[PDB]
Symmetry: C2
Subunit: 210 residues, 2 copies
Amino acid sequence: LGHIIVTGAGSGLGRALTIGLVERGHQVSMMGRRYQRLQQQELLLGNAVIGIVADLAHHEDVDVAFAAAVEWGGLPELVLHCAGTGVYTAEQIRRVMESNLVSTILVAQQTVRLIGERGGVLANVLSSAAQVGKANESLYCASKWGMRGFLESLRAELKDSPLRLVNLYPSGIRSEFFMTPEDAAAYMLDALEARSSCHVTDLFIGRNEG
Amino acid sequence: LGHIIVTGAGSGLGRALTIGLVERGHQVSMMGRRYQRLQQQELLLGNAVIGIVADLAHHEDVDVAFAAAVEWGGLPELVLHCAGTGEFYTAEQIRRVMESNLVSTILVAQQTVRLIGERGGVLANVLSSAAQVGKANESLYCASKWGMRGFLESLRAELKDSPLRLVNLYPSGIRSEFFMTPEDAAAYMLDALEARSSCHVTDLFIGRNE
């Protein structure tokens, strides 16, 4: 009955979050760039979800994807935005930030439009991939700080509006070959549980010691 | 699961945190200054708790408190420090509560590093902002809250290569001198303190529902 939208649903993180919300009885509109991963999730979870293929970095593409989501599940209670992640060149830089900041901005504006008056939750994942040496670090910092700048500025603007902004920070998730998606998701979904007198506004998760 | 130490155990929040932990199966050493509250809670929770009277700003109370705690329940797996204070400036009087906050924070922290620094476990600190309804002494609380945060973030970075983990919890808008309930706040904090294999929550920010 409870409709949730999850972007980057094909990521290890987005997969785990989608699975977890389903297990907690929610319907989930999965948005992702990679259709094969959306289908594999549809095969696993069936009528509890739909895969909407969308590239969230273009204003029209966002409009279309959200229209199908609302079409299938009605207005959402939670928009879970998983921006994911990724000697630098311009062409290397544009791509990264446009998949990240642009998607973040467009999903947020589309969410304000859709549920700004009705209320609900806009949850953003500013994930931090575990590097073994910190090679490309400064571009990731640029990326995540920009997103945080935008969102905390948007949340202060949405003071007194029924729409709540929640920012979630899993630091140390895997890619290219120690925080598991499952554990990350479980903290995040517990944190996103509704309670009468309060909610979690910010959640920082870090890796365990060896 | 294991033995926990709760400071400020008779405050609304400290009490809810204790009740929540005892319900989760833990044995709880309950530290605080309000001896009847502790006595009441001992009668309410029976064998699962012990009431330890301590002014945690006084080194001697601190040593005696932890000796008694460890002697009753063994080394803690978790020390949960609720400094928790608000006023309603002068130098001579008002430094009392403001300094009891920091000093108790520094002392509990230091006792915790000593007892469980090598073994490992969790030092969890509660940095509350009460729902003042007036705004009157706000710069004083900021000073206190930021003092504590600065000490703790410095201690945390200092402890990077050690199994003792430092967790900071920020319930911003609790009931006060007598919107956010202690019960909802505790529930969020104890979920976030739940242990998992690959990661743990480092910082939790809880905010009022509008």
